[PDB]
Amino acid sequence: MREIVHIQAGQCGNQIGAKFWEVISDEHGIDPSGNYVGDSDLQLERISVYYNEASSHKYVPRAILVDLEPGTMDSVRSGAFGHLFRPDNFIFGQSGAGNNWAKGHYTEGAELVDSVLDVVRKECENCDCLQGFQLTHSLGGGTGSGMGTLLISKVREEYPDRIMNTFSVVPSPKVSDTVVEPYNATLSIHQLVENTDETYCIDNEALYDICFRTLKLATPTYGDLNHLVSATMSGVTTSLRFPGQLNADLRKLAVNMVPFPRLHFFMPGFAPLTARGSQQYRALTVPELTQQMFDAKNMMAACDPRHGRYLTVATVFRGRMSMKEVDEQMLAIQSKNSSYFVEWIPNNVKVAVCDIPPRGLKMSSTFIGNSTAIQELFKRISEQFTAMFRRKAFLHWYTGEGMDEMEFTEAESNMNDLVSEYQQYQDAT
């Protein structure tokens, strides 16, 4: 019950999804062929939430892989853990978004969004009681941004009651992997703050920093970053895919973390993060995890929390632990950082506890902080957008697909309004 549908847009979304399904299959003991070879019945007691039991006793992920260029699709298809996706799912076009948002939302996307929605509808009717949607996409790449926003708008039209999750890879502050990414970011954020329940902001910069310093890895390949994001997502969903002394669901997180309709952008975090050698020289206790999760050097979003306040915080543990210990740790961490939390939300730590470790470890933890610091991010992007709009640079590519300036004017105004709201609530009293 409470089945979840997985959508993967853009190249980053698809790669993250490949690693994500690898992780999930490892969790439930699923062979690459798609048949169960596990050992613990609890794996199958909720196997339906992400998988569908196809006949002859096989399992197929409830995935809907979307793209506009067959390259990465075929890469996924050929590689291992690709032979179990249901082959009818791989929707792809030929033109390619060309790293443009106008193509990804108006011209090219309008031709595949119908087929995507049809497969979505088939999967929805297949499920018993739909729980919600999780969309894995970028914010820079044209396909990800444009087509994901279009799909979100259409789905919200057809399912205004379900819950919506997005794992959007926000552009990094220092580097810029693309050139027009401010435009894509602004338009995508406009659509998201329109029609999304929660948005898990991530930067590649923070993941680089974590893989470098904390994990002591000088050679971070994209496999590792995607592995980290996959572990975060698995930690988010294990609260319902598994039994727990204090269980959680996606709707619980949405209610707890989203005080106002618009302010629903979360920065995630994971713990423990230990190098290969520096592991046996540290104790794995709940206080250690809790103290690890609260610092700028372990936030997957490149913005110091100290510059603002945590509006709300959610914390999902795993593995066997003692509830009193967790409560004591949360009390201490809420006490000593009193200036780091908003005054008018007393007891602002949502807690959930699962019963299964994420494999290999004794106990893990996932942090989901809805703070005001992220305003800086938007601030940054907004400014960049403004600059690249003041000269109307690159404007012709977007204008040529039917979009006009007033779109950009409205989107920038909307983002500035959002930043104003964040600022207002940060200094509320």
Partner: protein, 435 residues
């Protein structure tokens, strides 16, 4: 022939019930499959019996999320419960009162009431209701409010006892606890005969200090609350030198229609290693019960006055010692009842000692005492919740979920007015009389 059904709402209720029914099945020598290889009948009051040697509980486990109920169905206590009772919803209230009282629970309330009616009509001397429900969870608050209103409509005058989990002052697992608490209190204030305040923080404290376990799981808190419940019902379920029925509880501990929130307390609670080194006098355990560090609600009794107390003893107890100990307690000044209630005790004695659950944490004792005390200190606790509510309402935080789920702001304002009125009543009663 004095039956009493149990209704467990929400995850807290279901787990507490797991503990409670484990305890009962241990007490009456009942195997997990309902078979059984001073006693009377005794078990008839809680266990109904079928043709074979198989007994089944009179419990109705209702939830909106099938996870915990599925754990129950898969646990060692699978064969026990009547499978029709284990009512499961589809999508839990997700810590939202409106979902648990207007949208979702509205679609299985009828099935729950139907099973309740079947179980009631199969009984003859029905005494009353035991609702095991938390206070913060959405299902707990909303569904319990709905169910209490429905039962009060159906069963006009019968006992209705709740075991709420009062939200702690400093440890809160939820974020919207004030909203659920205020709404469920405004609703249940007109229907619940007698609630039973218990908190997790105080039980953590007791487990750490007295039992000397530094890392307790919810299993331990559940075992303690189950022991409290068993001490409450031992009068019905056993032969005692001075028995007491739940109607006596509601008559004794409830001076006024609204002020019916007594907090629980249990003694002795000592580890197995510390079982010796003390003879456990009944006067000693009475003093332990009145010790402000042993109460199971984070409220100092010294800041208020005990409007009423009810001490239920069990084991090798002799009434003269109880009389002497209570006289001594009345002599001391730090325990100051209200002037207008000169008789502040109900005493009950049972012959059956408490039984220790194997794999448990406590030690085999010969005497035990559960105190249910209605005081005025609890009033301050309401203030705290009120305060929280005010802040979280001054910004209209989280309001959109409740608004869009079948509720209005005027309802929030009305519930705030009601809580203010209750606090006013507590303050007014706390004062002394003239002339």
């Amino acid at each position: 022939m004095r039956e009493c059904i149990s209704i467990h709402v929400g995850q807290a209720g279901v787990q507490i019930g797991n503990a409670c029914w484990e305890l009962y099945c241990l007490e009456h020598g009942i195997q997990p499959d309902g078979q059984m290889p001073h006693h009377h009948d005794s078990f008839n009051t809680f266990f109904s019996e079928t043709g074979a040697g198989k007994h089944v509980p009179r419990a109705v486990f209702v939830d909106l999320e099938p996870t915990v109920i599925d754990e129950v169905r898969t646990g060692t206590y699978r064969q026990l419960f009547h499978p029709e009772q284990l009512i499961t919803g589809k999508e839990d209230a997700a810590n939202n009162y409106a979902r648990g009282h207007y949208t979702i629970g509205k679609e299985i309330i009828d099935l729950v009431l139907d099973r309740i009616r079947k179980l009631a009509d199969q009984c003859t001397g029905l005494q009353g209701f035991l609702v095991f429900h938390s206070f913060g969870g959405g299902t707990g608050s909303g569904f319990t409010s709905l169910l209490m209103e429905r039962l009060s409509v159906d069963y006009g005058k019968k006992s209705k006892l709740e075991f709420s989990i009062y939200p702690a002052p400093q440890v809160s697992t939820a974020v919207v606890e004030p909203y659920n608490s205020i709404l469920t209190t405004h609703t249940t204030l007109e229907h619940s005969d007698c609630a039973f305040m218990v908190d997790n923080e105080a039980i953590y404290d007791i487990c750490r200090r007295n039992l000397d376990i530094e890392r307790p799981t919810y299993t331990n808190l559940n075992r303690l609350i189950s022991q409290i419940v068993s001490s409450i019902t031992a009068s019905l379920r056993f032969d005692g030198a001075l028995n007491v029925d739940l109607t006596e509880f509601q008559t004794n501990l409830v001076p006024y229609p609204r002020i019916h929130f007594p907090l629980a307390t249990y003694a002795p609670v000592i580890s197995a290693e510390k079982a010796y080194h003390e003879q456990l006098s009944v006067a000693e355990i009475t003093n332990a019960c009145f010790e402000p560090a042993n109460q199971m609600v984070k409220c100092d009794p010294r800041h208020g006055k005990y409007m009423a107390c009810c001490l239920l003893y069990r084991g090798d107890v002799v009434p003269k010692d109880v009389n002497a100990a209570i006289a001594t307690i009345k002599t001391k000044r730090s325990i100051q009842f209200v002037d207008w209630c000169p008789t502040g005790f109900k005493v009950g004695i049972n012959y059956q000692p408490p039984t220790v659950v194997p794999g448990g944490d406590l030690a085999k004792v010969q005497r035990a005492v559960c105190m249910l005390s209605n005081t005025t200190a609890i009033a301050e606790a309401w203030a705290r919740l009120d305060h929280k509510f005010d802040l979280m309402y001054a910004k209209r935080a989280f309001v959109h979920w409740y608004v869009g789920e079948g509720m209005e702001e005027g309802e929030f304002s009305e519930a705030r007015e009601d809580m203010a009125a209750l606090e006013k009543d507590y303050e007014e009663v706390g004062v002394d009389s003239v002339e």
